[PDB]
Amino acid sequence: SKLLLNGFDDVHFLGSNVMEEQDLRDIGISDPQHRRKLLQAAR
């Protein structure tokens, strides 16, 4: 039997996870203050 679904399942979940992990860290890399800290560093 193919039994491909049994394997893809673990993947179907990883997706939402990879987003939840990047969505929680993005808030810190997209913060407003970042502009003030990037301006003095880029200047």
User: Residue 43's CB: how many other CB atoms inside 10 A?
Assistant: 5
Phi/psi of residue 3, nearest 5 degrees: 50, 40
| Structural domains counted in the chain | 1
Among residues 17, 37, 19, which one has the least CA distance to residue 27? 19
Q: Within 13 A of 43's CA, how many CA atoms are on the CB side?
A: 6
Q: Could you give the CA distance from residue 33 to residue 20 in angstroms, rounded to a whole number?
A: 22
Q: Could you give the CA distance from residue 3 to residue 19 in angstroms, rounded to a whole number?
A: 26
The helix (run of H) or strand (run of E) holding residue 28 is helix 5-29
Q: What's the CA angle centered on 12, arms 10 and 13, to 5 degrees?
A: 70
Give the rounded distance of the alpha carbon of 29 from its chain centre: 11
Experimental method reported for this structure: NMR
Give the rounded distance of the alpha carbon of 11 from its chain centre: 15
The range of the structural domain enclosing residue 5 comes to 1-43
